[PDB]
Design a protein around this ligand. Sequence first.
Ligand SMILES: Nc1ncnc2c1ncn2[C@@H]1O[C@H](COP(=O)(O)OP(=O)(O)NP(=O)(O)O)[C@@H](O)[C@H]1O
Ligand SMILES: Nc1ncnc2c1ncn2[C@@H]1O[C@H](COP(=O)(O)OP(=O)(O)NP(=O)(O)O)[C@@H](O)[C@H]1O
Ligand SMILES: Nc1ncnc2c1ncn2[C@@H]1O[C@H](COP(=O)(O)OP(=O)(O)NP(=O)(O)O)[C@@H](O)[C@H]1O
Ligand SMILES: [Mg+2]
Ligand SMILES: [Mg+2]
Ligand SMILES: [Mg+2]
Lengths: 320, 320, 320
Amino acid sequence: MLVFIDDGSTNIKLQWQESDGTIKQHISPNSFKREWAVSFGDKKVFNYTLNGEQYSFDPISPDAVVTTNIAWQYSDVNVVAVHHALLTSGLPVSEVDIVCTLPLTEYYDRNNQPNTENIERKKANFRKKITLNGGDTFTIKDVKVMPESIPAGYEVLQELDELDSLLIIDLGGTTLDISQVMGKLSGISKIYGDSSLGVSLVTSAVKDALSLARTKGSSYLADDIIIHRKDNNYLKQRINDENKISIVTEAMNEALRKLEQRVLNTLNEFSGYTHVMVIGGGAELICDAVKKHTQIRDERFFKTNNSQYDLVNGMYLIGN
Amino acid sequence: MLVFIDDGSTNIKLQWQESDGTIKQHISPNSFKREWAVSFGDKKVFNYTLNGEQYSFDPISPDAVVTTNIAWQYSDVNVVAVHHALLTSGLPVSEVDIVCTLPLTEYYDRNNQPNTENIERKKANFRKKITLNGGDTFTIKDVKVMPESIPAGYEVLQELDELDSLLIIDLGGTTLDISQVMGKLSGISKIYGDSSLGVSLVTSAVKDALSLARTKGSSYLADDIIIHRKDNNYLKQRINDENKISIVTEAMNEALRKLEQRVLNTLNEFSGYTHVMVIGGGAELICDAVKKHTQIRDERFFKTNNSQYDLVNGMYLIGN
Amino acid sequence: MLVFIDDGSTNIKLQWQESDGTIKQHISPNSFKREWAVSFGDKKVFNYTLNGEQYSFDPISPDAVVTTNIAWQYSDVNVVAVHHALLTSGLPVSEVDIVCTLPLTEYYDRNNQPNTENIERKKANFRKKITLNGGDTFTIKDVKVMPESIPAGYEVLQELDELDSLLIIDLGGTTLDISQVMGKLSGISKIYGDSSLGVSLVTSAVKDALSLARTKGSSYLADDIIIHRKDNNYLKQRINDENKISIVTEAMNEALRKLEQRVLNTLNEFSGYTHVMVIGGGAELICDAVKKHTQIRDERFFKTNNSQYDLVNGMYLIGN
Ligand SMILES: Nc1ncnc2c1ncn2[C@@H]1O[C@H](COP(=O)(O)OP(=O)(O)NP(=O)(O)O)[C@@H](O)[C@H]1O
Ligand SMILES: Nc1ncnc2c1ncn2[C@@H]1O[C@H](COP(=O)(O)OP(=O)(O)NP(=O)(O)O)[C@@H](O)[C@H]1O
Ligand SMILES: Nc1ncnc2c1ncn2[C@@H]1O[C@H](COP(=O)(O)OP(=O)(O)NP(=O)(O)O)[C@@H](O)[C@H]1O
Ligand SMILES: [Mg+2]
Ligand SMILES: [Mg+2]
Ligand SMILES: [Mg+2]
C-alpha cells in the first residue's frame, strides 16, 4: 500500500488507490489535546501515546494544540496527526509506504535544490514510535518527500509550452507557499515561503471573537465558522451569544482584508508568469482578489472546486 | 575533440564533427541568474560556481544577467555560458579543444592585423576554473580565436574573383560587425564594429513592453517574441495582458525601424563591394532592407536559411 | 517647517533647519512588524495603524517587514517609516512640507527626464492616512521629490568645469544608483539603477548566519553586525553561539566579495568621467575597491565621513 499524505499543519490530506484501482481521498483535521479523552456511550475516542506523552483527537477543546508553525513539520504531534488520519481513513491497519510533503523553503535551498538535511529530518520524524490505546496503529515503512505547492500544477503544466510559466499560489493554515514553474515542469524560476502568512491570521482572530461570544473552542471550530461564513443560519446555530455575531463576522472580515493585502503585496514580487493557479484551503478566500490583481486573462486562471486537495491529488497523479 | 564555438553575447553556437564524420550543430541561449535554481519534479537544473559566485541557467527569470556588451567577451558569465552549451550539446563530458570568436574591432587593430593582446585575453578567460553542482564540467584544453563576420563568407569567397569584394554584414544581439573582404580571402578592405547597434535595441524595447503587459521575463523570452512576431496566435498565447498586445508589437515595430535606419546609414560608409552577404540572427530582420538599399543584383546577394549559424559553420569548414 | 527626507528602504535620513538657523540630522532604521508592540516598564513603544493594518517599530524582531525592493517606494510601510522618523527626530509634531526621494530609474525615464507618473505616485503615497496609538502624528502638507544619487554631488559639482563629469555611485540597502553628471550640474550623461544590487545581499547572508548561530533577529540587527564587522569584541557580545562567529564573519565576507565584484562590473559600463564619488551606507564597504578599480587620481576621488547622509545633505544645500 502506497498512500499520498499531504500532511499540512491544519489538515492531513490523504489520497491512495484501492485494490480495484479506484482513487480515494480523506481529510483529517489536526485538533489534538495533550490528554486522553473520555468515552461516553457510543463515542469512539482515539487516545495515543508518543514518547511518554498522551494525546487524543479532540475537535472542540479550546486546549487543542495550536500547530500553526514550521516546527510542526518535524514535531511529535505531526506523527500523531498522520497516524490518526490513517486510522480514520477507512484503510485497514497495515504497513504502508507514504509520500509526504514539506513547505517550499524547507524542501529547497536558496538555489532550488533539495535540502537533503531537512528532507531526511522529515523522513526520520515518522520513525518515532507511537501507541494507540486499545488498538493497533499502521506501521509506516518507506517515506519519500515532495515539495508543497508545485505538485498541484502537474496536469496544467502538461499542456503548457516550456516558455510559459505558472504561478502556483498555495495558501494554507500556516504558510503562503508560492512557486513559479516553467511549462512541462522543465524548470523552477522562483520559490517563496512565508510561514507567518497563513489563514491562521483569520483563524486566530475568529477564535478570540468566539471566546468573547462565549463559544470557547478549538482552532478547528473557528475554521469551521470561517468555512461557513456565508451561512447566517449556521453562524446563528453555532455562536452562543446571539448578541455578538457581528463581533465574530467583523473580526473575521478585518483579518480577511489583512490576509488579502498581505497576499497581494507578496505577488508584486513575482514577474513574467503567463499562468496563475491558486490552491489550498485558503484559495477560497483569496482567489477573486488574486485573479483581479494579476490581470491574467480568464482562460489562464486556475482554481478547482476542491482546492484543499489540489496538492495531494497532484502528488498522486505524479507518483502513483 | 575539436569544437567550434561561436560564443555570441546572446547565444552560443556550437559545431563539431562526430567520430563517424557527421557534422552536428547546437545553439545555447545565454540566460543566467546569479543564484542557484531549484529543481522540482523532473526538472534538471544547471547550477554553476565560478570564482566564488553562483549561477544557474534560467530562461524565464527577469533577473537573468543582461550580457549585451563588449566586456562579456572576457567575462566570467561567458565561461559559464560556454560550459553550459557544452553540457547541453549531447557531447560526453571531456577535454576538448575549441575555436571561439571575437568581434571584429576586438580581434583586429585599426590596421586589420590581429590584436594579440585582446586575442590572448580571450584565451585566458577560458582558463578560469568553474564547477557544476553535482556533476563534471568539460575541460577546455587548447583555445584558438577567429574573427566574427568574416569566416561566414568562406564558401562564397571561394568562387569569387580576387577583384570582387564581399560585404559581410553580421548583425548580432550586441554588435553590428561589418567586413569587406576580397575574393579568395586574398585581402580585407575594411572592418567595422558598432557594439551599440545590436538586436538588443529591439530586445530591450520588447522586454519593457512585455513587463507593462504583465509578462515580466528575461531578454531571452523577449527575443522569443521577436522570433515569433509574425505569429498572432503565438503572441496571444505568450502575452498575458490580451488587451496590450499592440503595445508589444508596436514597440517592437518602432525599434525595428530604428534598427533598420541605423544599419542602413552604416552601409553608406562602405563602397566598391561587388557582393553582399547578411549573416547572424539579426539577418532575418534587416535582409530585405539591405538588399533593396544596396541595389545589388539578385544573384550577388547572400542569405541562408540558418543565418544564426553561418559564422560557426564557416569556422568549421575552414578549421576542421 | 520644511524637512528633507531621504526615505531609503533601510533608513530614513532627515535633515532640516532649526528656527535659530542650525542644521539638524536624524536617521531612523526601517524595522517594523505587523503587530502592536507591548510596553513594559519605561519602554515607549510606537504603535501605528494605516489602512486598517497595525504596525510597531521593532528593531529586534525576526518578523520585521523586509523592505528591500522598489515597491517600497510607494508602499504603506514607507509612510509609517517616514512618520516614525519624524516622531523620533525631536521636532514637535506639526504640519511640515517635505522633500523626499526616488531611485534614479523611478525618478527618470530612459531619456533622463522626470517620470511625472512615478513622481506623482510618490507624492500621493504620503496622502495615505495614518494613526499613532495614544498620540498625534505629524501632518504631511506639501511634497516634492528629488532623485537619489545626484543631489549628493552638489558641492563638488560647483567647483567642477562643465567639461569634467562626476560619477556618483550611490550604494544603498536595496539599490545601486549610479549617475554621471557634468560640471555645474549642466548635464546628465547617464543614469543607472540596479535594484537587485544592494547591501541587502550582505544583510540577507548575515541574517541567515546569525539565525544558525542562534541569534535570530531583524535585518536591522544583521546590519548592525555588518557595521561592527571590524570589532571582534562587539561580535562576541552580540553573537550568542560563541562557537559559530566565523560562520557569520565568513558568510559576511563572501557576500562582500560578491557585492564588490558585482559593483565593479557595473562600473565598466561608464566612461569619460573625470571625477568619482561614492555615497550611501554601502560606500564604506566598496570605496577602496572603487578607487583602485577606477585608477582615478587621489584628488579626484570623493568620500565623506558620513556617507549615509551625503544625499539628504545635498538635498538640503540645494532646496533649503
Ligand atoms: N471551503 C473553504 N472556504 C474557506 N476557507 C477554507 C475552506 N476550506 C478550508 N478553508 C481554510 O483553509 C485552511 C486549511 O487549508 P489547508 O490548505 O488544508 O492548510 P494546511 O495545508 O493543513 N496548512 P500548511 O501547513 O500551511 O500548508 C483552514 O484554516 C480553513 O480555515
Ligand atoms: N529566426 C529569427 N527571426 C528574427 N530574429 C531572430 C531569429 N533568430 C534570432 N533572432 C534574433 O537575433 C539575435 C541573436 O542573434 P545572434 O546572431 O545569435 O547574436 P550573438 O551572436 O549571440 N550576439 P553578438 O555578440 O552581438 O554577435 C536575438 O536577439 C534574436 O532576437
Ligand atoms: N558605517 C557603516 N559601515 C558599513 N556599512 C554600513 C555603515 N552604515 C550603514 N551601512 C550599511 O549600508 C546600508 C544602509 O545604507 P543606506 O544608504 O542608508 O540605504 P537606504 O538609502 O536606506 N536604501 P536604498 O533604498 O537602496 O537607497 C545598510 O544595509 C548597512 O548595512
Ligand atoms: Mg498545505
Ligand atoms: Mg554573433
Ligand atoms: Mg539611499
